Design a protein around this ligand. Sequence first.
Ligand SMILES: CC(C)CCC[C@@H](C)[C@H]1CC[C@H]2[C@@H]3CC=C4C[C@@H](OC(=O)CCC(=O)O)CC[C@]4(C)[C@H]3CC[C@]12C
Ligand SMILES: CC(C)CCC[C@@H](C)[C@H]1CC[C@H]2[C@@H]3CC=C4C[C@@H](OC(=O)CCC(=O)O)CC[C@]4(C)[C@H]3CC[C@]12C
Ligand SMILES: CC(C)CCC[C@@H](C)[C@H]1CC[C@H]2[C@@H]3CC=C4C[C@@H](OC(=O)CCC(=O)O)CC[C@]4(C)[C@H]3CC[C@]12C
Ligand SMILES: CC(C)CCC[C@@H](C)[C@H]1CC[C@H]2[C@@H]3CC=C4C[C@@H](OC(=O)CCC(=O)O)CC[C@]4(C)[C@H]3CC[C@]12C
Ligand SMILES: [Zn+2]
Lengths: 93, 520, 135, 80
Amino acid sequence: SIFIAAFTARFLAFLQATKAQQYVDSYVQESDLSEVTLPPEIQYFTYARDKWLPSDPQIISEGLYAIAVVLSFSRIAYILPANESFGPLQISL
Amino acid sequence: CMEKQRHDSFSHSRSRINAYKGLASPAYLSLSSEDPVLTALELSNELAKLANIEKEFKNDYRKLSMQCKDFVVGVLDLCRDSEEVEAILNGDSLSRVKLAIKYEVKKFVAHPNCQQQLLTIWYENLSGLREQTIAIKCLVVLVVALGLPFLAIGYWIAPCSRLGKILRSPFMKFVAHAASFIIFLGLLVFNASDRFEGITTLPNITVTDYPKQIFRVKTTQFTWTEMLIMVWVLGMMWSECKELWLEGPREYILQLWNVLDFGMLSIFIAAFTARFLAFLQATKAQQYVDSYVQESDLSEVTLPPEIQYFTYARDKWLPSDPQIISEGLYAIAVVLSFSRIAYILPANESFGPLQISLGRTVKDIFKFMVLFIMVFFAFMIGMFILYSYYLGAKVNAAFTTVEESFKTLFWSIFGLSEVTSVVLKYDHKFIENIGYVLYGIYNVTMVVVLLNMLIAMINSSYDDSDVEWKFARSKLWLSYFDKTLPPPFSLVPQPTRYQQIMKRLIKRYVLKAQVDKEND
Amino acid sequence: GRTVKDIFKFMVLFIMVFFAFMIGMFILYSYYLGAKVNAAFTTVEESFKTLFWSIFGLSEVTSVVLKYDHKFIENIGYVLYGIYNVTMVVVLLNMLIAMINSSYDDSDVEWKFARSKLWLSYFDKTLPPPFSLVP
Amino acid sequence: SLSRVKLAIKYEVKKFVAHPNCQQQLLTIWYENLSGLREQTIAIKCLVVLVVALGLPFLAIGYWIAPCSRLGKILRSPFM
Ligand SMILES: CC(C)CCC[C@@H](C)[C@H]1CC[C@H]2[C@@H]3CC=C4C[C@@H](OC(=O)CCC(=O)O)CC[C@]4(C)[C@H]3CC[C@]12C
Ligand SMILES: CC(C)CCC[C@@H](C)[C@H]1CC[C@H]2[C@@H]3CC=C4C[C@@H](OC(=O)CCC(=O)O)CC[C@]4(C)[C@H]3CC[C@]12C
Ligand SMILES: CC(C)CCC[C@@H](C)[C@H]1CC[C@H]2[C@@H]3CC=C4C[C@@H](OC(=O)CCC(=O)O)CC[C@]4(C)[C@H]3CC[C@]12C
Ligand SMILES: CC(C)CCC[C@@H](C)[C@H]1CC[C@H]2[C@@H]3CC=C4C[C@@H](OC(=O)CCC(=O)O)CC[C@]4(C)[C@H]3CC[C@]12C
Ligand SMILES: [Zn+2]
């Protein structure tokens, strides 16, 4: 479920990003985006890592993804009891 | 066997176990064949191998192997003359003792009747030194360490002399090897003298004896004690390669301690090879300077850069300079060379059992360290994936890379890493709080795994602790019974009488068993 | 008292391992006296000092890092320091286990024997040391 | 089918299931259709794990054609 949550948050961030990209490509015409001044709700998606809103969906995605990776490494418990030397150690643990 | 295996394989295995339980019986062992002690030893080895192979009836085969070992020890116990002890310890040289050491029969070798014979072989040609205190024997070690060159040259004339017999005794062989290793450690230490209180000149400064010479020639030249270390390592490597050629690579690699010894000697060889390459480059630069340029002092001259590089001080030095590799490998080799005390400690009465217990705990520590590695890699990858994007953002570059993440997570085991590792300069609280939580979970998990390791070792801890040490010491003795000079100086170039004794012993065993059975 | 009598042997083993690693780290870092950020392993005194205080976690991990851009020596310092810490932990655990095993009304009779020795020492020393000078 | 073994696992009867007479049967069911691989060392079995990890896409597509093949039986064994 935490993997699902991380990927859902990443997908929401991607949807917002591609909506901003669609707005930029649709309404404004120029050579480089940097010279242009954009509406702020759309311009926010041009900001770097530091500016990013604390509750950005991609921050949630990164955090949940790290937790999910740490937990996914725990699945070795389904595999260890088959071994002759690591089984009893897992039982005692 | 294939036909019996096709149908009722379980019954086939059960029949094999029944046949072996019949063969491993003391009754059939004693009354079956001539020389039943060898039969029982061989059957013990066979049953141990089949216990390792089957792995379902492992306990049955181990019980039968213990039966065979107990029969051998019981037959040995009944000896009440020196002739019978000698007859059991070697068949019609200590043959049965070697064969019981090979088959791991610990109570046969740690039995007083066997230990007394091994002790009279050990302290041969020097009877008085058996009863001296530990202080006097250690003092003898020191005396041999101080006088070993002289005794080395005297051993050439020794075979006629009585002192040659005194030196040829196994105890003096062991004392000579121990004093030799002591001299080796003393050389390793004394080579690092004149730096005990610190280097005198800063690494920025270059000091040379005469102006024309290159500074690297001064830095990489072989001092006398270093050449002595080189010939020493060559001698040890010769001995080890000789035993490798004899026993063969397959059997040689099996013992892990022999692999450690080979690696230590190889690392010494690597350090000296790198030092020699640096010295060759330095002397080539010196030869260029002396050949092509003419001046009073080298400092005033401007040289080609490839040759001039060898005039640089410590700081300028290329990161992959061969002498840096030499220093690193030499430090590792010294640290590993100090570990050779394991070849010497089992002879002692007070330090032997401690070494045995330490070895056992290490054998369990390996498995618990494997679990440590699994958990540690889990958390390392988690923290790296979390904090890698914030390289410039973090106040302390702790989890920004996989190297730094491994570093800080390892040093967190010993509490030597700060808690300010996870805090961010940026105003993101979700990532920083998840870092807090993951770091805390990691610390708690490491503590739990350590506690589980300690408990498992305590439970696995339980006169077997005495017989294991006596077995290790007896292996140490037999290694010297039949290696005369230390590595540095080893470079220079009517049934039968036995059938009567065995019949008497087996009669005693059968009678004792029948009396013990009827009495109960 | 019994635990101390075993602690002596395990401290002898401690001393062997500690001297091994002390000489190793000294031979490694002695050439970098001005180079190291912290003069930890530059001399045998400082090396003994930092390796002893590492047992109690009171010595920093910035001991082994260099100011100079040599990574081989600094990484070997990292590895040797980590191996030393792990080895000290293993020897401590082995000491604890050996003492636990050696721990087993004998504990009562040993104390009563010690107390009876204390008593017989006073059965037949009348005045304390300060006032036992007067004759 | 191992009915009593399943029912003893459900009722937590540990010595019935850990008995050699039961373990031998569970082992002959476990290493089914591959008899030789029972005695190989741990290194070789772990190497088999690595081989399967490298070749799993191909064996996945081959399992569709496998039920007729003998390799399908090799793959259908519980150990594989
Ligand atoms: C059995 C399976 C289907 C369980 C899967 C559960 C998820 C479908 C739910 C449970 C928790 C939910 C998440 C809780 C936290 C967030 C934070 C949220 O971040 C914001 O939208 C705030 C910023 C903004 O205004 O956009 C994004 C949705 C997300 C991932 C939610 C998406 C839907 C999630 C992943
Ligand atoms: C590279 C390391 C330090 C990071 C952690 C790796 C582990 C997350 C994984 C990678 C490979 C896995 C191993 C792959 C091989 C096996 C097979 C399996 O053991 C057996 O084959 C049992 C033998 C039998 O079947 O009778 C389970 C343990 C083990 C070691 C696995 C344990 C978990 C391991 C070590
Ligand atoms: C059984 C015995 C013979 C084993 C001995 C092995 C050595 C002969 C081999 C194994 C590893 C080798 C070493 C691996 C690392 C290096 C680094 C290398 O450094 C460089 O040359 C890089 C800088 C430069 O360009 O010169 C010097 C050679 C050396 C010591 C190699 C020399 C030959 C070594 C010591
Ligand atoms: C100065 C110290 C703190 C640094 C480490 C020294 C050790 C690396 C070496 C130096 C002298 C060695 C000792 C020299 C004397 C012996 C002889 C030997 O013990 C016996 O003689 C056994 C008695 C017997 O033969 O029955 C092995 C242990 C011991 C203490 C050696 C153990 C290893 C020692 C202590
Ligand atoms: Zn046959």
